[PDB]
Amino acid sequence: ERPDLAWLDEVTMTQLERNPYEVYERLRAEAPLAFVPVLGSYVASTAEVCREVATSPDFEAVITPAGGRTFGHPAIIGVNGDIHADLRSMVEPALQPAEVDRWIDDLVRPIARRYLERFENDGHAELVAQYCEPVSVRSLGDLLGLQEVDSDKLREWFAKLNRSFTNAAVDENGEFANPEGFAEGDQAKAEIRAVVDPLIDKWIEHPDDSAISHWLHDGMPPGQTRDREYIYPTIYVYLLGAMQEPGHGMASTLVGLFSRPEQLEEVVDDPTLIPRAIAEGLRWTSPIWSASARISTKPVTIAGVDLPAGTPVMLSYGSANHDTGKYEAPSQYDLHRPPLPHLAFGAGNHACAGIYFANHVMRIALEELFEAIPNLERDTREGVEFWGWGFRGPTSLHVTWEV
Ligand code: HEM
Numbered sequence: 202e203r204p205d206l207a208w209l210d211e212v213t214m215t216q217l218e219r220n221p222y223e224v225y226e227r228l229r230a231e232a233p234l235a236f237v238p239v240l241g242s243y244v245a246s247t248a249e250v251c252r253e254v255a256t257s258p259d260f261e262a263v264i265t266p267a268g269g270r271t272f273g274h275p276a277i278i279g280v281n282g283d284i285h286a287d288l289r290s291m292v293e294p295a296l297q298p299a300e301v302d303r304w305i306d307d308l309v310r311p312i313a314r315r316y317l318e319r320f321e322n323d324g325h326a327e328l329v330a331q332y333c334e335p336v337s338v339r340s341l342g343d344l345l346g347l348q349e350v351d352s353d354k355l356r357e358w359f360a361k362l363n364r365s366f367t368n369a370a371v372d373e374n375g376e377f378a379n380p381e382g383f384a385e386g387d388q389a390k391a392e393i394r395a396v397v398d399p400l401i402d403k404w405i406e407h408p409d410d411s412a413i414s415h416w417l418h419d420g421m422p423p424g425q426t427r428d429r430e431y432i433y434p435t436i437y438v439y440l441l442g443a444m445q446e447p448g449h450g451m452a453s454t455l456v457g458l459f460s461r462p463e464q465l466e467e468v469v470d471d472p473t474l475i476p477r478a479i480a481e482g483l484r485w486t487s488p489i490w491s492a493s494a495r496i497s498t499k500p501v502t503i504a505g506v507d508l509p510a511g512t513p514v515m516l517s518y519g520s521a522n523h524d525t526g527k528y529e530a531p532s533q534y535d536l537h538r539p540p541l542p543h544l545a546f547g548a549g550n551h552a553c554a555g556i557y558f559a560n561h562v563m564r565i566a567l568e569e570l571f572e573a574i575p576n577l578e579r580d581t582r583e584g585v586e587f588w589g590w591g592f593r594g595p596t597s598l599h600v601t602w603e604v
Pocket residue numbers: 255277278279289292296341439442443444446447450483487488489493494516518544545546547548549550551552553554555556558559560
């Protein structure tokens with residue numbers, strides 16, 4: 202509809218999945234709020250627009266169309282008002298910093314050592330599948346009460362939910378262009394129900410210290426639990442992004458450090474720099490790149506665009522974190538970048554609830570990795586490809602080291 206942006210009509214879903222950064226560089230210069238036809242939605246590409254939409258009193262949360270098709274109702278990311286307040290009160294106890302500090306080290310550190318012990322003397326590894334993803338899912342899986350779900354299965358589930366959630370391509374009529382792309386999401390959810398329904402059955406009668414047991418019981422009148430249909434969409438929110446993103450974040454941080462070998466040596470020599478390295482890694486390739494959204498609740502003007510009430514806006518935080526209004530040469534990883542606010546955890550009432558936990562999982566994992574393999578080198582015989590528009594990270598990270 203907007204004549205000067207007619208080139209957007211030719212942007213494809215595959216191009217956004219393989220490398221969204223070229224199109225979004227144009228968006229940030231040309232139209233910080235722009236309707237992208239293949240996504241069927243306005244997209245916010247700059248830091249100022251993302252932060253304004255995420256915190257505006259005239260916007261509320263909405264799930265993207267493919268996200269809603271995947272999660273249903275009431276996903277914590279997609280609801281507001283009393284339901285959102287309840288779901289936030291449900292998830293927040295185990296994520297409170299003082300609580301996380303009581304047990305996070307005893308949780309993640311033995312998990313990291315267990316996965317490292319399987320390959321640390323091989324001289325070669327593919328760190329995404331052998332380390333980053335397993336540590337991420339095994340840590341959260343144990344916290345949740347899914348100790349008996351193998352890390353292979355948790356990784357499979359978040360990959361299928363990822364592809365379903367981000368199956369966003371639409372045709373000229375706004376209809377999903379890839380309707381068969383939700384089937385593996387439905388298949389994953391069916392498997393999850395078969396595993397988790399008996400656990401919920403048991404937790405209702407015998408509560409324990411698992412997070413999902415507390416989701417059922419916390420804050421309820423005596424003898425009542427939250428209905429499982431009411432909590433399952435937030436279980437799915439966890440089984441996608443909460444399982445996937447810490448692994449994405451540590452892997453992207455490592456890829457960034459490899460691209461600056463002198464900074465990798467700095468961080469290995471001084472592991473107190475690991476949190477700073479992770480924060481730059483999240484800015485450099487944001488794990489949640491363009492997954493979440495808001496919807497206007499009244500007519501509003503954003504970036505010169507007069508939006509009617511009921512207008513969805515996708516928050517492309519991964520693009521906002523390359524805003525050259527904030528950063529110099531943002532496409533380069535730089536451990537010594539002047540620390541600034543970033544949007545990798547979002548903003549507003551629907552900002553990430555698990556920031557403190559996630560940073561600790563990533564930090565401890567990198568601590569243990571650099572301790573066990575101080576001479577880690579990237580396998581330059583292999584290249585690192587990143588994939589994903591909604592959620593983005595490296596598909597593999599081949600490394601070598603002298604044994
Ligand atoms: C590096 C890892 C992670 C990153 C980069 C990340 C980032 C994000 C982002 C961008 C959002 C959407 C915010 C918005 O729309 O403004 C979000 C939401 C959320 N995240 Fe995180 N996340 C990570 C890990 C986790 C973990 C491990 C958990 C749970 C233990 C978690 C729990 C949540 C929840 C519950 C929400 C929904 C909040 C709401 O809608 O009220 N996240 N996260």
